[PDB]
Amino acid sequence: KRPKSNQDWWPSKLNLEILDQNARDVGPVEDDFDYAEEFQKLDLEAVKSDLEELMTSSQDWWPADYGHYGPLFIRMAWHSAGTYRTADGRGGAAGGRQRFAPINSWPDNANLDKARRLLLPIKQKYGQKISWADLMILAGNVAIESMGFKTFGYAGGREDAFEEDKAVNWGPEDEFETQERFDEPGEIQEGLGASVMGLIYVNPEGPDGNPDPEASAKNIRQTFDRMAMNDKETAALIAGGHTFGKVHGADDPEENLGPEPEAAPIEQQGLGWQNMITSGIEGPWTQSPTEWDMGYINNLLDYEWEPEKGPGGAWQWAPKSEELKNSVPDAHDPDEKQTPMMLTTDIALKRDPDYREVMETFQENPMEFGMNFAKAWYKLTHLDMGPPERFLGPEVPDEEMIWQDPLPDADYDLIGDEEIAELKEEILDSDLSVSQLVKTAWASASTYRDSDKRGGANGARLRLEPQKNWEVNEPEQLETVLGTLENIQTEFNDSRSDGTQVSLADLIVLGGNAAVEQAAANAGYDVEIPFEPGRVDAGPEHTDAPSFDALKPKVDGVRNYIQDDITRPAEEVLVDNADLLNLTASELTALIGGMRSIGANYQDTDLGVFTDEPETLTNDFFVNLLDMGTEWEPAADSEHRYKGLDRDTGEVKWEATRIDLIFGSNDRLRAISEVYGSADAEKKLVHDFVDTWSKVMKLDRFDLE
Amino acid sequence: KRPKSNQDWWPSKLNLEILDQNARDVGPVEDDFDYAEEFQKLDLEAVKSDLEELMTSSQDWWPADYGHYGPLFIRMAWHSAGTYRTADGRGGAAGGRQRFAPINSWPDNANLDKARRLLLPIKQKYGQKISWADLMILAGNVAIESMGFKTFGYAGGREDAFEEDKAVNWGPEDEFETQERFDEPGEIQEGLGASVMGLIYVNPEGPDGNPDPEASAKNIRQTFDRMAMNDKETAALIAGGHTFGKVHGADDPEENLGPEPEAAPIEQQGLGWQNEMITSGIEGPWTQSPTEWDMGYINNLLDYEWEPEKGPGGAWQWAPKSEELKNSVPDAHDPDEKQTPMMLTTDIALKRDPDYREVMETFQENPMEFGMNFAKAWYKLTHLDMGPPERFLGPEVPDEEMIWQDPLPDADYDLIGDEEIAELKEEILDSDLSVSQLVKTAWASASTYRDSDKRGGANGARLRLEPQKNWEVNEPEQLETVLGTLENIQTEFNDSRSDGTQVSLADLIVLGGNAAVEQAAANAGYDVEIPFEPGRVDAGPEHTDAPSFDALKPKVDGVRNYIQDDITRPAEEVLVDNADLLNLTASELTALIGGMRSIGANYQDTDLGVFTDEPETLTNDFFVNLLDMGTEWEPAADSEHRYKGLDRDTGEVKWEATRIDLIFGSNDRLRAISEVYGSADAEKKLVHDFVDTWSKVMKLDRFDLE
Ligand code: HEM
Ligand code: HEM
Ligand SMILES: COc1cc(-c2ccc(N)c(OC)c2)ccc1N
Ligand SMILES: COc1cc(-c2ccc(N)c(OC)c2)ccc1N
Ligand SMILES: [C-]#N
């Protein structure tokens, strides 16, 4: 057989594999060339022209419905972007991971293997100039446009991934198409973007397979909310999408479709579900499936529907009236007709009071329907690309959307080297301690997540809602620090006579850098942190406060903060968050260990601060953590604390949390700790800590990407 | 609560994670600096002095038996080296992987977590200058020396690993201490070095837990053979090792020991089996003076009759009949009290098995023979995965080189320069040898290298010697033709020189392969220059233990599209396994195979996977044609390994292929790689990536230049 993994023997073992994905860029691409530059060479119009031609160029191995592949490509694009979760920013279309397991084999993505295959010739023709990620969304756009609906815009810039995202927790289920995440509709366990394992959002037949529209609406609303969409956006997306195409269920997929791609014979060459059957549900929603119109909303609202069992054995709805009987041409047989159908999830938009009001308004105002759908489709397919700077191409709208967390332009000259050294001196001479400066700079930068490129120190949103009031940021203390930095900003700006100004965003980072350099100096090391001025201060007007709550940490390793709510072990969350900062196991270890010598804990506790000289960057954390002269045990009447007792005297030496101790427990982390805890490794640790600190401070500076 | 793995959803999914380990070197250490350079700065004598002191420095958390930690460290070292398998060269002490799961938590390694912990202070004191891998073996050596026995030598140079070796298949079992690998003793399933999951070699109580010494001997013999040891070496190692220390089994480990390290609470900080020590569950010393080298083990074993019994830990062990041995050994933690010696079923195996008995009787008759065999075997055991002699570092490396080191002769001549290189290259190209013959031969020479134990490679030209010259995959008849031609070129060149310069066949083979690759690239319109490093030498039969090279014989060869008919695993699984031995990443493997198929260097010159109309022309045709949807694939009827690529419209056969070729268009990750190379503007990139990989493989065993 195959070599059994440590994960099998020890299910609770830390999944450091997720951090290993950050140690290098998998794939054959030159680890130095940037996609942005290659996409800039692309003739977008040419690709769009080829896509337009493809829409009606049917291939025998997968005949186009109604002679137009458009709807199939829209479904492909919707599923690509549809896995996005606001909770961690993972999922989504930014890396084109629909191409890799497990997503490529989810029951919900049945036959999208054929859809992606139809695009291979175009991908090969343009090569590196256009990624699969960008191409899949572009195909969706061209499909919509070719069928009569102009899109709001399009931006390239999604770099292809070469493997699945191992950090994503898709759910607790052990089987696809099953759910163990909700008892009552609308109460799905936190963190998940779907109500069923293997589905994009919800079950098309209804919750738990029961055709209950009212209940379905509850799951639709919650899942879409977790994917950053409100009622109007959700109704607009579902109605706009189902205005096109049909569902396929000529017979039961359970007995007529072969294995999914990952389980299919090698000769299938990446394809799966060898037989048209896809979902098991059969029929079109509208009379003209390849034309943009009000057909879906009209069919849904102007007729009464009844639940029935379709030819594929699945729950679907049919109209009572015989007016719609055989009103749609068959998708392949020119001399046959077909009757429209509705899904339980479509009826949900008509039964649910709030959705119903939106739909009725759309029906009365086709223009509003179009406007809302175009804007929602753009948001759906671009929400994980980050700030406007990352949106590339000639089709990028001039308008910047709030979900792009836009940053204002700097209406002033940037400070130079002399000014920089000047400001660093003044910050250190203030009443702010090294610990306060480090903690504040971390609070500002640590919100960044590479999953959807949100967060970071640029914009100084730390000073705005909701961040300024986050428990972990210690609001009271934070205002004091920001107050002092603001006074320095004011004094600096007022003393200039040449148009130069400094942002609070830059001062926060510069202050952190200065404090780290000082901590290193206290230890006898001369280190200089490279600094790149240019960060600006964003305002409340261009900040969707509620949307930033998804960036609130539940566990912060640097500040040794652990929320009492957490269900997962603290170290598990630590690794999860470390991945969002693109950290490797060694980088995370150097960061935490070095930080404990400085001492930047939440509420200034002594947790993990294994040193007698705080604010002095050394490898004392490792030296003391590894000393066998100390024995550790859980603290009494404590939920997160542990005591380090002198093995002999029995006197308390230190106190710590699982965050600190995992580095001396996990086999791999311990090997790293032993390197840093060696007699002649202090300089190395200091330098590695500094490199990681610098890395994190610059994560959201795409001005050089 | 935690993210799932595709491994769980699809058990048959290729484990490409093993190749990913070759893309990056996890750990906080860079790469610009080599461990050898750091070890060179180490004061070996100083470390040994500290180790000698450690031997008698008892820590209260794991008090030394008999006031000397020596035996415990010997066990630690034997277990570190003891996981080695000759089949793939994996396991062993070279990376110190005993420190990581699953090995660190195997039942056979119980309490070695404490042994390794006792060495932490010394490790921290010397830092990067001495690896854990080197330190564990050194501790064993110092322990042996401190107890009265001189070792044969010691070499440093084992670079520490920072994670487990994901490529090792430890066995089919789903539970430690169980076996589903043998129905009859001595008939263990191939590819495994132990008879039980979680054990080093065999069950100390006997096969399947039965105290049958004769049967035990069959498993001991087979497992040690799979770890490169014969009867004399095996008997010497077991008898020599058990001359020291004791087994610990104060009570049943099943209900008195806490979770193994990987499952233990965070506060235990890497330690496990939290409990009158209990380790194996077997209890008692083998000899009267457990911390002194003598003939105590062999004498106790052969001079007295033993009987099986259940010990205080509920395990099988043997007790002496004679009352002369009763209470003859001081208690491990109390010299004022005594204990009776014991023997394991595996020790009685050496007395009951006819062949082992003969060896043991010889050892008892001449202590000097016993001693030398043990010293030589201990050195071999602990250094067999370190590669050739050039990799053995330090002041304690013996002047004598052993055959298991696959030694190489010195070049007693001047090396050829750029002028002669170009000259020889033209001569090879002007010969009647084809591009395919040259590439196939160079590959046959270099492809035997394995990064696991650093054996194999093009240096030495062992391809021309037994057993390689007769391997089916190497096409003996065809090989002789190529070597005959290159040897004539060598003779002609050497005889025409006068400045003392000479060229080796080893270098000519690689030079010829490089010239052929350059020519194939030229046929495609690409001008490539492959860097060549002369200096390889020609090893002779006297430098080659032929039978030991059988272990390097490929069952599947991707470059030559060769698949042995008697393979149990799917061909692509073996392909990945072999790719790992060549330190290849998924992308390097893809570029190598795809590029090779455009050249066409198949076993028996078949057209399998040769998706091009212009063979011997290096292009990306393999990828372009593999990805063309105008072709549909199907298994070839009445064929075990073949598939047909049919024109989707006419049904006419376009190509033939094996799973080695088709996996690059089936596996989700490999397909993503193939799509890059099969794109309109990627041919030049593929050519350069193929050349880079080809060159990398050709130089794998060049450590003197490494
Ligand atoms: C409550 C959410 C949704 C559910 C449960 C759902 C469900 C389904 C199911 C069962 C199918 C049929 C697959 C098949 O048998 O071929 C289908 C297809 C389709 N969906 Fe949705 N969908 C939802 C949302 C959306 C959105 C947000 C869009 C795009 C803006 C979209 C667009 C389409 C298109 C165009 C097709 C037809 C594909 C074709 O003709 O081949 N859907 N959907
Ligand atoms: C047929 C192969 C062998 C078997 C089944 C085996 C078995 C065992 C067992 C069960 C223990 C006791 C662990 C414990 O309870 O503490 C042990 C200890 C020991 N073994 Fe072996 N062993 C074998 C080979 C070897 C070899 C090759 C060496 C070294 C050249 C070695 C050296 C030792 C030493 C020195 C100890 C004593 C450790 C101590 O005092 O703490 N063994 N062995
Ligand atoms: C459980 O019955 C099935 C359902 C689906 C399915 C359901 C909903 C959506 N949205 C979908 O993606 C279009 C596929 C796919 C396959 C089977 N068998
Ligand atoms: C199943 O009962 C056990 C057995 C052993 C065990 C078995 C074989 C050897 N050789 C050993 O020493 C390393 C320990 C260890 C723990 C338990 N419980
Ligand atoms: C599809 N929905």
Ligand SMILES: [C-]#N
């Ligand atoms: C056994 N050692």
